[PDB]
Design a protein around this ligand. Structure first.
Ligand SMILES: CCCCCCCCCCCC(=O)OC[C@H](COP(=O)(O)OCC[N+](C)(C)C)OC(=O)CCCCCCCCCCC
Ligand SMILES: CCCCCCCCCCCC(=O)OC[C@H](COP(=O)(O)OCC[N+](C)(C)C)OC(=O)CCCCCCCCCCC
Ligand SMILES: CCCCCCCCCCCC(=O)OC[C@H](COP(=O)(O)OCC[N+](C)(C)C)OC(=O)CCCCCCCCCCC
Ligand SMILES: CCCCCCCCCCCC(=O)OC[C@H](COP(=O)(O)OCC[N+](C)(C)C)OC(=O)CCCCCCCCCCC
Ligand SMILES: CCCCCCCCCCCC(=O)OC[C@H](COP(=O)(O)OCC[N+](C)(C)C)OC(=O)CCCCCCCCCCC
Ligand SMILES: CCCCCCCCCCCC(=O)OC[C@H](COP(=O)(O)OCC[N+](C)(C)C)OC(=O)CCCCCCCCCCC
Ligand SMILES: CCCCCCCCCCCC(=O)OC[C@H](COP(=O)(O)OCC[N+](C)(C)C)OC(=O)CCCCCCCCCCC
Ligand SMILES: CCCCCCCCCCCC(=O)OC[C@H](COP(=O)(O)OCC[N+](C)(C)C)OC(=O)CCCCCCCCCCC
Ligand SMILES: CCCCCCCCCCCC(=O)OC[C@H](COP(=O)(O)OCC[N+](C)(C)C)OC(=O)CCCCCCCCCCC
Ligand SMILES: CCCCCCCCCCCC(=O)OC[C@H](COP(=O)(O)OCC[N+](C)(C)C)OC(=O)CCCCCCCCCCC
Ligand SMILES: [Cl-]
Ligand SMILES: [Cl-]
Ligand SMILES: [Cl-]
Ligand SMILES: [Cl-]
Ligand SMILES: [Cl-]
Ligand SMILES: [Cl-]
Ligand SMILES: [Cl-]
Ligand code: NA
Ligand code: NA
Ligand code: NA
Ligand code: NA
Ligand code: NA
Ligand code: NA
Lengths: 311, 311, 311, 311, 311
């Protein structure tokens, strides 16, 4: 067929409802995620209307090819969704109740400023282009919106799955387009990051600082340079599970700032030795004793300065 | 057609049966696995009933398009299963015997607390949404449940493949949903982990402790710092074949605890040298001799404390 | 059917228009990118013409199988596009207004000479092969060309999406081919590259130069050789997120030039020690004091020489 | 249609024949491989029998949908095969000659005990489930079994492609199943392994042993610990192109045994120094001179012991 | 329909022609490459013949389902090609002019003996199996063979795309098979390999040789062992972008030979120190002075010997 004709001159309202069955594969570098969910559609098509008393059955099942169904599409998806139609029910007044189960790969940008303490807002944009004959608007049936209790996103906590009830209606290539915003709110599980990356990164740094309670250049150079190399291993490791951000990330700042604490430790160590060869173990030991406090203090100051700038 | 009508207000029981042909690709990070199996369905549709004497044939074959077949779906799957229909047999009383061979990628969370000594319980959730006209319930035909003797999951031992006989029946978008739980129990093969990761990780640690039977700071710093670097190589290697767990894993704890045994060894070595420059080889050698026992003992204490906390 | 016949002997003009919905996965090594966009086509087929007064409807919808549609194809694609037809509208004069939403993986070479400060010009080549009966030419409807305000290419800034209005018409396997050039202009977001790769690469180099304010060969060899090893880690890391270019890249040149500053630092350090064993701490300290300026100066000269040669 | 009925009470024999066109992607970790081959089937269906004089053609071509074709399936495959039908020829007596060209990813476990000198036996299990009306058995037409001479598996030698002529017939879910075993025998090409992994692994070990012709702890610790680190690089590299085996592999044993030769070298070096600080360069040099022979000898003994245990 | 019948007793000649639109993804390890090209077929089918005067049109278009089309297949492909039919033109005499645009993943072995100075000959084998009724032979229409001017294979130079005009005709499972050989000749772009791998690999080796102008064992051991470790990083890096070859590669030989120049440098350094402890700085300095020439000379001799053996 073709669209149901207006029963006045009114835009056709299509009622939507996404129900998350599964959430999986949140790819941080690609800024994508996969979803498996129910998509529930509902519209009024009077042409399909009937009498429950006459036909003796209060609901009518239909195969999708048989009736007019709106061309609903996802906006922020890599390829068109994979969908199997579950049910089509028509109530006496001509109300269609569409239900399909779909799966799709979704493009939603992530903000890494507060990584790995960051929280995200994933989006699923539902859309419909209107026909010449008829204008189409989307609406949210809040009863058919949700997620099941099990959905689990490896590595994240799931706060809420809600929808912006008012659609964004606009012209696109001389036709009306109705766009809905479904929002999945998530928070990163950062427990593992503390013993697996953060504390080791600090231990290797604190080991570099033992060159302040040592008079031997040879051993000091080894202490600082070897631990600096270990810090590079961690800088490379963490920047690889991350995309090319045009903004300073929080961990990125910490790591970068640490590169200076190794550089300045090399300066101190280079100085302490230079004075011993010039025969002033006098000020060499003053500098070495100063560094012992200066470094832990400046480090702790800087980390507070940064945490304040980012949280 | 449409569902078989009730003799009376009784829900339709659909008999299920999963038979594993192949198990493969248990992805630890993604918390998924692939399965290739038979799915056997069986229901009563009186409309299909016949006389063996009249039609002269005791069993009737049907093409799937011809008859009513329940919309059975897997819950915890990435995308809908890939299935080829094997056989449809109808017995005189109107009993349908459906058989399809399918393959699917299945989402089942794994518990890494006891990794790599962990055992898992994989799930395959079978489901059916009920129609307006008729309610549908799932049931387990225990004769059509199993796995063949060859199924092999690279890297794991397979205990049992059984099913929770009582379905979980619940409302979902104002309709009854019948859900079955098929359970594949597995245990990790950890033989390789001992010589390929655990013993090397300990050898590099024991090598770090030779700095207690040495008076030379330069060589001691080298011993401890070099082996610490080797330990980082193993920490990175094992945390990469693992996902971002919001709980302390057992190996994660061991590894993290080892990072301290390197840090404290650096403290001892830094101290032993500091006293020699202050001219008290007196207590320096007391500390060095104490460490020789303190470290192996505290290490062995801690490992018992941990194994007890996790097993 | 078959192509619309000419009124005289003029080739058939097909009006094109690409509208980018999404841009994603710019793979630098493969020199590809994925696109999700609208493709709008428009041609004159008099056979379809009608009377608005007689048929009582001013616009006619058609299913794609029903009418003649030109075989439009993308040139620089891995596989043929994935497309779902959105709308076909026929105006009284026989003007067809085709609209499909497609997604494709596109091959477009990138120039890495100025990497990571490089800017690119991606291409989408639209094409049509002509029939024996009729000649077909492509044209640009500039109103149906664009991108939405959200398109975001992880890791890049998007300047413009425009089209070369004049098609390239040529013979290919004894038939006319009409080719259009759609151009997506982009610029790389290089912020992260400075603290995550460039500054660390320089800090490790400046640390190598502390061997000029040191008289100890053992510590000097350690300083230079250890930092050289750290530089290899960065050379390998950056050449891996890059393809095998038959031209000198800018970062490639910097990195390569740095390999010499380590090699020549080893020469200096090897010399300084050799003279002290020959008992001329006389010129050894002249050379060491010269290097202190020579290296930072020559390095800064060279970097200017290079930046000038590339920008 | 449905199966051809029996003349008298004999099961239907289906003649099989796999002809390998290509072998590729033997994935060692996944224990899989891809195959591209011809599958030739042949059975008697009298219902199709015809007269060459009447129908005027001595052989009849048929489209697969038109006639009864047995549901032949591969057992040990990830997903169902990708197949394009080449030819269906029916001879006057009702003999069908089926030919399809397929491609599939096949699950076949590999034995890594003798890796990288190991040889494998890959399997392709052909199967057929029997109908209610008729029993089906598979058979091997040895003339339609083979591989072309050009067929190569990157990184491997192909001995033979043969089939176990006698099928394994058994009950599965109350029906007869006929299973055939096609065997591809292969041997690993290990040439590259000697200069790219084995000899370097030994050179780094022999370098560690130069600490026996040296009196300097500082240099000795460096020699042994640095080469131990290089050995870890090789242990990690080779265990990554390998799956998690619940059995000791041969290379796994060699590598593990080497970890001890580094550990015991550290003991010796730690001892030699300890005696020099205790002033017995007397026995220190006895031990050091003993090690010089003890290590190469014990190493060579152990390697023979191992090679004997595995070959 | 079925094949066109002969005019005598001559096999049917099918004229072929591959036209490369795109070449991409030359995977060195897998020994594959992707291709996007036109496939042009042409045969004589008299049944289709017509009169230009009577039907008034000199060419006839046909949909593929309507006429007999030969079953043309690629031999050395992973899976069957993805093809969209472009055009079918029938000239009055009954000459069919088939044209499809396809894309496929192609298996073609590469020879790594001269890597990274190697040149390759990729193959595309076109094939056709003959029917009982008729014999089919392939032929090359050299006008419909080529590549466009843009084809670019990231990382390679493309010499020529030509075809072996004489097909290889042979029996396969009691039927004639006609096989054509299309050859894509390529040469590796090795510019990047010199500054990104070769020169660094040599610089680290030349740095190891500075231990000949040094009397200090501790610093010498560091120089040689540290650079040896850096050489392992490069050996692992280059053998990973390479498959498991059962033949000595040229770079493989160079790398392996270098492993000896590090081993023998360790011998020299171990000797020079041993004589100093035995008090013969007499011959120690003779050996050290000899090595200074012996190493650069033997190295340069060996490289010439190798280049001669491989080029
Ligand atoms: C008294 C010494 C002060 C050092 C101050 C260093 C400032 C560095 C600023 C870098 C800014 C980016 C080119 C860097 C070479 C390393 C410097 C070696 C210092 C030598 C110490 C001599 C001790 C008398
Ligand atoms: C070394 C660096 C240490 C990192 C310190 C955490 C920064 C912080 O303060 O983190 C804050 C987050 C919560 O962030 P929020 O909920 O978004 O607060 C929003 C704040 N507004 C409303 C003011 C904008 O708490 C954590 O993760 C606490 C765990 C820290 C563990 C550190 C272990 C070492
Ligand atoms: C005798 C001193 C003991 C030091 C104890 C240090 C506790 C560290 C905290 C553990 C965290 C888990 C900030 C750390 C600086 C490095 C310590 C340098 C020690 C100097 C020794 C001087 C000998 C007189
Ligand atoms: C130091 C290195 C770490 C040692 C690891 C010990 C782990 C352990 O104690 O593991 C115990 C587990 C078995 O536990 P389970 O079968 O799952 O009991 C579950 C049943 N419940 C629920 C009733 C408790 O496996 C082992 O015995 C592994 C052998 C370890 C060999 C280590 C050699 C060195
Ligand atoms: C005193 C003059 C130093 C000459 C340095 C040689 C530069 C070689 C340039 C190679 C360019 C690529 C071939 C390199 C050999 C090792 C160099 C050993 C240096 C010994 C210094 C002795 C101190 C008197
Ligand atoms: C290590 C070497 C440091 C890199 C030096 C910058 C390269 C450059 O000069 O880059 C310049 C480009 C901009 O180039 P453009 O404007 O697009 O081209 C203009 C072409 N003209 C000249 C023909 C008009 O990027 C930048 O502004 C980079 C700023 C990076 C700061 C790095 C701090 C360390
Ligand atoms: C001669 C003493 C040999 C000791 C051997 C130790 C075997 C350990 C077995 C582990 C099982 C795998 C605590 C362990 C530290 C290493 C031992 C340091 C030795 C000091 C030498 C003193 C010389 C008088
Ligand atoms: C590291 C230590 C060196 C490894 C020693 C190789 C083991 C071996 O000797 O391996 C033997 C295998 C072949 O054994 P098979 O074909 O299975 O015959 C088994 C038949 N039986 C059961 C009757 C005995 O390797 C080879 O052909 C030898 C290649 C060795 C090259 C290594 C150079 C260094
Ligand atoms: C005189 C030194 C000759 C060196 C010969 C070495 C042959 C090694 C064969 C390896 C085969 C691949 C076992 C190797 C130990 C290292 C050698 C230590 C040298 C001691 C120097 C003594 C000075 C008089
Ligand atoms: C240290 C390793 C240095 C590598 C030396 C190149 C080997 C070679 O000699 O390479 C030679 C090949 C040329 O091969 P071809 O002419 O096409 O052979 C076909 C002709 N026949 C049949 C007569 C053999 O490559 C080159 O021109 C190499 C350029 C090398 C630059 C590297 C500088 C350092
Ligand atoms: Cl969609
Ligand atoms: Cl499913
Ligand atoms: Cl409920
Ligand atoms: Cl209900
Ligand atoms: Cl296309
Ligand atoms: Cl199959
Ligand atoms: Cl093909
Ligand atoms: Na419809
Ligand atoms: Na049905
Ligand atoms: Na059409
Ligand atoms: Na059939
Ligand atoms: Na055809
Ligand atoms: Na050192």
């Amino acid at each position: 067929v073709s669209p149901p004709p207006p029963i006045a001159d009114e835009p056709l309202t299509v009622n939507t409802g996404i129900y998350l069955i599964e959430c999986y594969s949140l790819d941080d570098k690609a800024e994508t995620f996969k979803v498996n969910a129910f998509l529930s559609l509902s519209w009024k098509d009077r042409r399909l209307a009937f009498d429950p008393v006459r036909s003796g059955v209060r609901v009518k099942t239909y195969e999708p090819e048989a009736i007019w169904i709106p061309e609903i599409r996802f906006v922020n998806v890599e390829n068109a969704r994979d969908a199997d139609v579950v049910d089509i029910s028509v109530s006496p007044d001509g109300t269609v109740q569409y239900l399909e189960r779909f799966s799709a790969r979704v493009l939603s940008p992530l903000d890494f400023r507060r990584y790995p303490f960051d929280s995200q807002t994933l989006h699923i944009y539902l859309i419909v282009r209107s026909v010449d004959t008829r204008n189409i608007v989307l609406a949210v049936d809040l009863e058919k919106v949700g997620k099941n209790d099990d959905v689990f996103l490896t590595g994240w906590d799931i706060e809420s799955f809600t929808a912006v009830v008012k659609p964004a209606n606009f012209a696109l290539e001389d036709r009306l387009e109705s766009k809905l915003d479904y929002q999945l709110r998530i928070s990163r599980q950062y427990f593992s990051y503390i013993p697996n990356i953060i504390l080791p990164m600090l231990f290797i740094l604190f080991i570099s600082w033992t060159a302040f309670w040592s008079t031997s250049y040879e051993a000091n150079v080894t202490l600082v340079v070897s631990t600096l190399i270990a810090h590079i291993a961690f800088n490379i490791l963490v920047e690889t599970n991350l995309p090319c951000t045009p903004y300073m990330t929080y961990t990125g700042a910490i790591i970068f700032m640490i590169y200076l604490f190794y550089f300045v430790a090399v300066i101190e160590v280079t100085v302490q030795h230079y004075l011993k060869v010039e025969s002033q173990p006098a000020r060499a030991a003053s500098i070495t004793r100063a560094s012992r406090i200066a470094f832990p203090v400046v480090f702790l100051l800087a980390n507070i300065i940064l945490a304040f700038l980012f949280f």
